[model samples]
Target: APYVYANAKALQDTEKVGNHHQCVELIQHYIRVGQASTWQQGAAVFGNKNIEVGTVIATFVNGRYPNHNSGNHAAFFLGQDTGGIWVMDQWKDDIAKPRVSKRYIRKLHNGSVRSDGTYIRMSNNAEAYFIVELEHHHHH
Candidate 1:
Protein backbone atom coordinates (compact mmCIF):
# COMPACT_ATOMS: atom_id res chain seq x y z
CA ALA A 1 0.00 0.00 0.00
CA PRO A 2 1.34 3.43 -1.02
CA TYR A 3 0.40 6.87 0.29
CA VAL A 4 0.74 10.49 -0.89
CA TYR A 5 0.37 13.88 0.78
CA ALA A 6 -2.57 16.18 0.08
CA ASN A 7 -2.16 19.71 -1.11
CA ALA A 8 -2.05 22.32 1.66
CA LYS A 9 -5.18 24.08 0.40
CA ALA A 10 -7.11 20.90 -0.34
CA LEU A 11 -10.06 19.89 1.86
CA GLN A 12 -8.14 16.83 2.94
CA ASP A 13 -5.18 18.87 4.01
CA THR A 14 -5.65 17.84 7.63
CA GLU A 15 -7.26 14.47 7.02
CA LYS A 16 -4.17 12.24 7.05
CA VAL A 17 -3.51 11.55 3.38
CA GLY A 18 -3.81 7.87 2.67
CA ASN A 19 -4.91 5.47 -0.07
CA HIS A 20 -8.09 6.24 -2.01
CA HIS A 21 -9.89 3.00 -1.25
CA GLN A 22 -13.20 4.42 -0.04
CA CYS A 23 -13.21 6.81 -2.97
CA VAL A 24 -12.48 4.04 -5.46
CA GLU A 25 -15.25 1.89 -4.00
CA LEU A 26 -17.77 4.64 -4.55
CA ILE A 27 -16.69 5.12 -8.17
CA GLN A 28 -17.14 1.45 -8.91
CA HIS A 29 -20.63 1.60 -7.47
CA TYR A 30 -21.53 4.53 -9.70
CA ILE A 31 -20.15 2.72 -12.72
CA ARG A 32 -22.60 -0.12 -12.19
CA VAL A 33 -25.34 2.50 -12.55
CA GLY A 34 -23.88 3.94 -15.75
CA GLN A 35 -22.20 7.04 -14.36
CA ALA A 36 -18.82 8.69 -14.97
CA SER A 37 -16.25 10.48 -12.79
CA THR A 38 -14.55 13.81 -13.43
CA TRP A 39 -11.93 16.08 -11.88
CA GLN A 40 -14.27 18.66 -10.36
CA GLN A 41 -16.57 16.40 -8.31
CA GLY A 42 -14.53 16.54 -5.15
CA ALA A 43 -17.34 16.63 -2.60
CA ALA A 44 -18.62 13.13 -3.31
CA VAL A 45 -15.13 11.94 -4.12
CA PHE A 46 -11.72 12.60 -2.60
CA GLY A 47 -8.97 14.32 -4.60
CA ASN A 48 -5.84 15.94 -3.22
CA LYS A 49 -2.12 15.59 -2.57
CA ASN A 50 -1.06 16.19 1.02
CA ILE A 51 2.54 15.01 0.99
CA GLU A 52 5.29 14.21 -1.50
CA VAL A 53 6.34 10.69 -2.38
CA GLY A 54 8.92 9.07 -4.63
CA THR A 55 6.58 7.53 -7.22
CA VAL A 56 3.26 5.81 -7.97
CA ILE A 57 -0.18 7.41 -7.39
CA ALA A 58 -3.76 6.24 -7.71
CA THR A 59 -6.90 8.24 -8.40
CA PHE A 60 -10.30 6.63 -7.95
CA VAL A 61 -13.84 7.94 -7.86
CA ASN A 62 -17.36 7.71 -9.25
CA GLY A 63 -19.13 9.47 -12.15
CA ARG A 64 -22.54 10.94 -11.66
CA TYR A 65 -25.39 11.94 -14.02
CA PRO A 66 -27.64 14.43 -12.36
CA ASN A 67 -31.33 14.37 -12.95
CA HIS A 68 -32.38 16.45 -15.96
CA ASN A 69 -28.75 17.57 -16.26
CA SER A 70 -25.55 16.46 -17.88
CA GLY A 71 -23.49 13.76 -16.20
CA ASN A 72 -20.25 14.42 -14.32
CA HIS A 73 -17.24 12.34 -13.26
CA ALA A 74 -14.80 12.89 -10.43
CA ALA A 75 -11.67 11.22 -9.11
CA PHE A 76 -10.46 10.47 -5.58
CA PHE A 77 -6.74 10.53 -4.99
CA LEU A 78 -5.57 7.37 -3.31
CA GLY A 79 -2.32 6.39 -1.61
CA GLN A 80 1.02 6.55 -3.37
CA ASP A 81 4.49 5.40 -2.41
CA THR A 82 7.83 4.74 -4.05
CA GLY A 83 6.50 2.46 -6.81
CA GLY A 84 4.13 5.18 -8.18
CA ILE A 85 0.44 5.33 -9.19
CA TRP A 86 -1.32 3.37 -11.89
CA VAL A 87 -4.31 4.27 -14.12
CA MET A 88 -6.90 1.57 -14.81
CA ASP A 89 -9.42 3.22 -17.15
CA GLN A 90 -9.23 5.13 -20.41
CA TRP A 91 -9.53 8.90 -20.07
CA LYS A 92 -10.02 11.80 -22.43
CA ASP A 93 -7.05 13.92 -23.47
CA ASP A 94 -8.04 16.76 -21.17
CA ILE A 95 -8.47 14.41 -18.20
CA ALA A 96 -5.38 12.34 -18.74
CA LYS A 97 -2.58 14.26 -17.12
CA PRO A 98 0.35 12.05 -16.26
CA ARG A 99 2.49 12.83 -13.24
CA VAL A 100 6.28 12.85 -13.20
CA SER A 101 6.78 9.44 -11.55
CA LYS A 102 6.76 5.68 -12.09
CA ARG A 103 3.78 3.66 -10.73
CA TYR A 104 1.71 0.59 -11.49
CA ILE A 105 -1.88 0.24 -10.19
CA ARG A 106 -3.12 -3.32 -10.20
CA LYS A 107 -6.72 -3.30 -8.89
CA LEU A 108 -9.91 -1.36 -9.60
CA HIS A 109 -12.93 -1.76 -7.34
CA ASN A 110 -16.21 -1.82 -9.25
CA GLY A 111 -19.19 -1.13 -6.93
CA SER A 112 -21.28 -3.83 -8.60
CA VAL A 113 -19.16 -6.48 -6.92
CA ARG A 114 -19.44 -5.14 -3.41
CA SER A 115 -21.63 -6.85 -0.82
CA ASP A 116 -23.45 -3.70 0.37
CA GLY A 117 -23.90 -2.08 -3.05
CA THR A 118 -25.43 0.97 -1.37
CA TYR A 119 -23.20 3.55 -3.08
CA ILE A 120 -24.97 3.04 -6.42
CA ARG A 121 -28.47 3.25 -4.98
CA MET A 122 -29.63 6.57 -6.36
CA SER A 123 -32.89 8.31 -5.43
CA ASN A 124 -32.39 11.33 -7.68
CA ASN A 125 -32.31 9.03 -10.70
CA ALA A 126 -28.60 9.52 -11.23
CA GLU A 127 -26.12 7.19 -12.88
CA ALA A 128 -22.36 6.85 -12.67
CA TYR A 129 -19.28 4.85 -13.63
CA PHE A 130 -16.29 3.53 -11.78
CA ILE A 131 -13.05 5.36 -12.61
CA VAL A 132 -9.49 4.63 -11.53
CA GLU A 133 -6.13 6.05 -12.60
CA LEU A 134 -2.59 4.92 -11.84
CA GLU A 135 0.52 7.07 -12.06
CA HIS A 136 4.00 7.51 -10.67
CA HIS A 137 5.79 10.74 -9.72
CA HIS A 138 9.48 10.70 -10.53
CA HIS A 139 11.81 11.96 -7.83
CA HIS A 140 14.84 13.88 -8.92
Candidate 2:
Protein backbone atom coordinates (compact mmCIF):
# COMPACT_ATOMS: atom_id res chain seq x y z
CA ALA A 1 0.00 0.00 0.00
CA PRO A 2 1.14 3.56 -0.71
CA TYR A 3 1.37 6.32 1.90
CA VAL A 4 -1.55 8.52 2.86
CA TYR A 5 -1.04 12.05 4.17
CA ALA A 6 -3.62 13.57 6.53
CA ASN A 7 -4.43 16.59 8.65
CA ALA A 8 -5.00 15.70 12.22
CA LYS A 9 -6.47 17.86 15.01
CA ALA A 10 -3.34 19.95 14.48
CA LEU A 11 -1.56 19.81 17.80
CA GLN A 12 1.01 22.54 17.82
CA ASP A 13 1.87 26.01 19.04
CA THR A 14 2.28 28.14 15.97
CA GLU A 15 3.06 31.05 18.26
CA LYS A 16 6.34 29.82 19.77
CA VAL A 17 7.52 27.13 17.40
CA GLY A 18 6.64 26.45 13.77
CA ASN A 19 4.90 23.35 12.34
CA HIS A 20 7.89 21.08 13.05
CA HIS A 21 7.72 21.36 16.79
CA GLN A 22 4.20 19.98 16.82
CA CYS A 23 5.41 16.48 16.02
CA VAL A 24 8.09 16.74 18.72
CA GLU A 25 5.51 17.65 21.29
CA LEU A 26 3.20 14.91 20.08
CA ILE A 27 5.89 12.24 20.41
CA GLN A 28 7.19 13.37 23.77
CA HIS A 29 3.65 13.76 25.03
CA TYR A 30 2.69 10.36 23.71
CA ILE A 31 5.66 8.55 25.26
CA ARG A 32 5.86 10.52 28.48
CA VAL A 33 2.24 11.10 29.39
CA GLY A 34 0.85 8.43 27.09
CA GLN A 35 -1.76 10.89 25.82
CA ALA A 36 -2.40 13.07 22.82
CA SER A 37 -0.44 16.32 22.79
CA THR A 38 -2.32 19.59 22.94
CA TRP A 39 -2.48 22.13 20.16
CA GLN A 40 -0.75 24.41 22.63
CA GLN A 41 2.59 22.78 23.60
CA GLY A 42 5.45 22.32 21.08
CA ALA A 43 9.06 23.23 20.22
CA ALA A 44 11.50 22.42 17.42
CA VAL A 45 13.48 19.13 17.06
CA PHE A 46 16.26 18.32 14.59
CA GLY A 47 18.30 15.25 13.38
CA ASN A 48 17.96 12.01 11.38
CA LYS A 49 19.39 8.55 10.62
CA ASN A 50 19.88 5.74 13.14
CA ILE A 51 16.38 6.99 13.90
CA GLU A 52 14.72 5.57 16.93
CA VAL A 53 11.01 4.87 17.36
CA GLY A 54 10.11 8.46 18.31
CA THR A 55 12.36 10.98 16.61
CA VAL A 56 11.22 14.36 15.31
CA ILE A 57 12.21 15.56 11.82
CA ALA A 58 12.14 19.04 10.28
CA THR A 59 12.43 19.23 6.50
CA PHE A 60 12.64 21.85 3.75
CA VAL A 61 11.58 20.00 0.61
CA ASN A 62 11.61 22.31 -2.38
CA GLY A 63 10.37 21.43 -5.87
CA ARG A 64 8.02 19.03 -4.16
CA TYR A 65 5.01 19.05 -1.72
CA PRO A 66 3.13 21.81 -3.56
CA ASN A 67 2.95 25.06 -1.49
CA HIS A 68 6.05 24.49 0.62
CA ASN A 69 6.28 28.17 1.59
CA SER A 70 9.85 28.20 0.29
CA GLY A 71 10.00 24.61 1.48
CA ASN A 72 9.11 23.95 5.11
CA HIS A 73 7.62 20.87 6.82
CA ALA A 74 7.98 18.91 10.02
CA ALA A 75 6.75 15.67 11.55
CA PHE A 76 7.30 12.87 14.02
CA PHE A 77 9.63 10.14 12.68
CA LEU A 78 8.34 6.59 12.85
CA GLY A 79 10.94 4.04 11.69
CA GLN A 80 8.68 2.17 9.25
CA ASP A 81 5.27 0.61 8.94
CA THR A 82 3.69 -2.41 7.38
CA GLY A 83 2.97 -0.11 4.44
CA GLY A 84 6.23 1.89 4.13
CA ILE A 85 8.38 4.68 5.61
CA TRP A 86 6.13 7.42 7.02
CA VAL A 87 5.91 10.62 9.01
CA MET A 88 3.30 12.57 10.99
CA ASP A 89 3.64 16.07 9.63
CA GLN A 90 1.23 18.98 9.34
CA TRP A 91 0.62 19.21 5.58
CA LYS A 92 -3.11 18.94 5.36
CA ASP A 93 -3.84 22.68 4.93
CA ASP A 94 -0.86 22.97 2.61
CA ILE A 95 1.35 22.68 5.72
CA ALA A 96 0.03 19.67 7.52
CA LYS A 97 -0.23 15.91 7.16
CA PRO A 98 -0.38 13.14 9.70
CA ARG A 99 0.79 9.53 9.71
CA VAL A 100 1.86 9.10 6.09
CA SER A 101 4.66 7.51 4.07
CA LYS A 102 7.74 9.56 3.15
CA ARG A 103 9.36 7.30 0.56
CA TYR A 104 8.98 9.55 -2.49
CA ILE A 105 10.92 12.56 -1.20
CA ARG A 106 13.94 13.37 -3.40
CA LYS A 107 15.61 16.33 -1.74
CA LEU A 108 15.97 17.14 1.93
CA HIS A 109 17.58 20.45 2.82
CA ASN A 110 17.58 20.19 6.62
CA GLY A 111 16.60 17.65 9.30
CA SER A 112 16.87 17.11 13.08
CA VAL A 113 15.52 15.51 16.26
CA ARG A 114 14.20 16.52 19.72
CA SER A 115 15.35 15.03 22.95
CA ASP A 116 15.17 16.31 26.59
CA GLY A 117 13.22 19.21 25.07
CA THR A 118 15.52 20.81 22.51
CA TYR A 119 15.83 21.17 18.71
CA ILE A 120 19.39 20.22 17.63
CA ARG A 121 19.79 20.94 13.92
CA MET A 122 22.54 18.85 12.37
CA SER A 123 25.45 20.21 10.33
CA ASN A 124 26.17 17.04 8.33
CA ASN A 125 24.30 15.63 5.32
CA ALA A 126 22.31 13.58 7.88
CA GLU A 127 21.07 11.11 5.27
CA ALA A 128 17.44 11.26 6.36
CA TYR A 129 15.04 8.53 5.20
CA PHE A 130 15.50 7.30 8.70
CA ILE A 131 12.87 7.08 11.47
CA VAL A 132 10.72 8.50 8.78
CA GLU A 133 8.70 9.74 11.77
CA LEU A 134 6.34 7.94 9.67
CA GLU A 135 3.61 5.31 9.58
CA HIS A 136 0.49 4.92 11.73
CA HIS A 137 -0.43 7.02 14.78
CA HIS A 138 1.72 6.14 17.75
CA HIS A 139 2.32 2.58 16.66
CA HIS A 140 4.29 0.77 19.35
Candidate 3:
Protein backbone atom coordinates (compact mmCIF):
# COMPACT_ATOMS: atom_id res chain seq x y z
CA ALA A 1 0.00 0.00 0.00
CA PRO A 2 0.98 3.68 -0.42
CA TYR A 3 1.39 6.36 2.33
CA VAL A 4 -1.37 8.30 3.98
CA TYR A 5 -1.19 11.66 5.79
CA ALA A 6 -3.26 11.84 8.96
CA ASN A 7 -4.98 14.44 11.06
CA ALA A 8 -3.89 15.12 14.66
CA LYS A 9 -6.75 13.37 16.42
CA ALA A 10 -6.56 10.31 14.18
CA LEU A 11 -2.82 9.91 14.72
CA GLN A 12 -2.68 10.65 18.45
CA ASP A 13 -3.69 7.08 19.23
CA THR A 14 -1.04 5.43 17.03
CA GLU A 15 1.62 8.02 16.21
CA LYS A 16 5.05 6.70 15.34
CA VAL A 17 8.15 8.57 16.62
CA GLY A 18 11.10 7.14 14.76
CA ASN A 19 12.57 7.48 11.27
CA HIS A 20 9.84 9.00 9.10
CA HIS A 21 7.66 9.49 12.13
CA GLN A 22 10.46 11.43 13.76
CA CYS A 23 10.63 13.71 10.77
CA VAL A 24 6.97 14.63 11.30
CA GLU A 25 7.68 15.81 14.83
CA LEU A 26 10.86 17.62 13.85
CA ILE A 27 9.20 19.51 11.03
CA GLN A 28 6.16 20.35 13.11
CA HIS A 29 8.30 21.58 15.99
CA TYR A 30 10.39 23.65 13.63
CA ILE A 31 7.25 25.50 12.65
CA ARG A 32 5.75 25.84 16.09
CA VAL A 33 8.91 26.62 18.01
CA GLY A 34 10.54 28.62 15.24
CA GLN A 35 13.86 26.91 15.81
CA ALA A 36 15.13 27.35 12.26
CA SER A 37 16.60 30.72 13.22
CA THR A 38 14.96 32.15 16.34
CA TRP A 39 12.32 31.06 18.85
CA GLN A 40 9.00 32.85 18.78
CA GLN A 41 6.00 31.29 20.45
CA GLY A 42 3.06 33.24 19.00
CA ALA A 43 4.62 34.75 15.92
CA ALA A 44 2.84 34.55 12.59
CA VAL A 45 4.79 31.46 11.74
CA PHE A 46 3.60 29.89 14.94
CA GLY A 47 0.29 31.69 14.95
CA ASN A 48 -2.66 29.85 16.44
CA LYS A 49 -4.62 30.03 13.21
CA ASN A 50 -1.92 28.36 11.15
CA ILE A 51 -1.52 25.35 13.39
CA GLU A 52 -4.12 22.61 13.16
CA VAL A 53 -4.87 19.08 12.02
CA GLY A 54 -5.57 18.32 8.34
CA THR A 55 -4.12 21.61 7.12
CA VAL A 56 -1.45 21.17 4.46
CA ILE A 57 0.60 24.37 4.41
CA ALA A 58 3.45 24.95 1.96
CA THR A 59 6.06 27.57 1.11
CA PHE A 60 7.07 28.93 -2.29
CA VAL A 61 10.03 30.65 -3.93
CA ASN A 62 10.51 32.50 -7.22
CA GLY A 63 12.63 30.02 -9.16
CA ARG A 64 15.58 30.33 -6.81
CA TYR A 65 15.73 27.84 -3.98
CA PRO A 66 15.86 29.34 -0.47
CA ASN A 67 18.52 27.33 1.36
CA HIS A 68 20.88 24.75 -0.08
CA ASN A 69 22.70 23.95 3.15
CA SER A 70 19.74 22.42 5.02
CA GLY A 71 18.05 21.24 1.82
CA ASN A 72 15.67 23.28 -0.29
CA HIS A 73 12.33 22.13 1.13
CA ALA A 74 10.73 21.01 4.40
CA ALA A 75 7.22 19.79 5.25
CA PHE A 76 5.18 18.56 8.23
CA PHE A 77 1.70 17.46 9.33
CA LEU A 78 0.09 19.14 12.35
CA GLY A 79 -1.35 16.92 15.05
CA GLN A 80 -3.39 19.87 16.34
CA ASP A 81 -5.39 22.84 15.11
CA THR A 82 -3.06 25.49 16.49
CA GLY A 83 -1.06 25.81 13.28
CA GLY A 84 -2.09 22.91 11.06
CA ILE A 85 0.44 21.77 8.42
CA TRP A 86 3.69 23.68 7.98
CA VAL A 87 6.04 23.74 4.99
CA MET A 88 9.13 25.91 5.06
CA ASP A 89 12.07 26.52 2.76
CA GLN A 90 14.37 28.95 4.60
CA TRP A 91 12.99 28.37 8.09
CA LYS A 92 11.01 30.30 10.69
CA ASP A 93 12.61 33.53 9.50
CA ASP A 94 9.57 34.09 7.32
CA ILE A 95 7.51 34.92 10.36
CA ALA A 96 10.21 36.30 12.64
CA LYS A 97 11.81 38.77 10.23
CA PRO A 98 9.10 39.02 7.59
CA ARG A 99 10.32 39.02 3.98
CA VAL A 100 7.94 40.22 1.37
CA SER A 101 9.55 38.44 -1.56
CA LYS A 102 11.64 35.79 0.07
CA ARG A 103 9.05 33.22 1.24
CA TYR A 104 5.29 32.71 1.50
CA ILE A 105 2.64 30.07 1.94
CA ARG A 106 2.34 27.91 -1.15
CA LYS A 107 -0.48 25.43 -0.65
CA LEU A 108 -2.91 24.34 2.04
CA HIS A 109 -4.44 20.86 1.92
CA ASN A 110 -7.53 20.01 3.91
CA GLY A 111 -7.05 16.28 4.28
CA SER A 112 -6.96 13.39 6.73
CA VAL A 113 -5.26 10.05 7.34
CA ARG A 114 -6.49 6.60 6.46
CA SER A 115 -6.71 3.47 8.61
CA ASP A 116 -3.66 1.88 7.00
CA GLY A 117 -1.71 5.17 7.22
CA THR A 118 -0.60 4.84 3.61
CA TYR A 119 -2.80 7.41 1.96
CA ILE A 120 -3.70 11.12 2.39
CA ARG A 121 -6.11 12.88 0.05
CA MET A 122 -6.89 16.60 0.08
CA SER A 123 -10.29 18.01 -0.74
CA ASN A 124 -8.99 20.06 -3.67
CA ASN A 125 -6.67 17.40 -5.05
CA ALA A 126 -7.70 13.82 -4.54
CA GLU A 127 -4.60 12.43 -6.25
CA ALA A 128 -2.20 13.89 -3.68
CA TYR A 129 -0.36 11.50 -1.35
CA PHE A 130 1.48 11.52 1.99
CA ILE A 131 3.14 8.85 4.14
CA VAL A 132 2.03 8.84 7.77
CA GLU A 133 3.97 7.63 10.81
CA LEU A 134 4.50 8.20 14.56
CA GLU A 135 7.56 8.10 16.79
CA HIS A 136 9.59 10.07 19.34
CA HIS A 137 9.21 13.84 19.21
CA HIS A 138 12.98 14.30 18.76
CA HIS A 139 15.87 12.65 16.81
CA HIS A 140 15.94 14.75 13.67
Best candidate according to lDDT: 2
Residue 12 of model 2: what lDDT? 35
Per-candidate clashes come to: 50, 19, 20
| Model 2 misplaced stretches (Cα beyond 4 Å) | 1-49, 60-69, 80-84, 92-140
lDDT of candidate 1 over 1-140, digit per residue (tens) = 12222331132222222234232333343232222222212122112244232111222223223323222222333443333332222223223322112224322334232343333432111112222222334422
Which portions of model 1 show Cα errors greater than 4 Å?
1-34, 37-76, 86-140
Model 3: lowest-lDDT 10 consecutive positions: 36-45
User: Where does candidate 2 have its weakest 10-residue lDDT segment?
Assistant: 35-44
Q: In candidate 2, what are the lDDT values of residues 1-140, reduced to their tens digit?
A: 11112222233333223344443344343333222221212222223334443354443222111122333344554444323344443333333433333322322343333343222232121322222223245544
Q: What TM-score would candidate 2 get against the native?
A: 0.29
Higher-lDDT candidate among 1 and 2? 2
lDDT of 3 by residue, 29-117 (tens): 32342322221111122333434443323211222212322322334334323424333212234344232112223223543334532
Which rank order by lDDT, best down to worst? 2, 3, 1
Question: TM-score winner among the candidates?
Answer: 2
Local lDDT at 131 for model 2: 21
Error of 2 at 3 (Å): 24
**lDDT of all the models against the reference?**
0.27, 0.32, 0.29
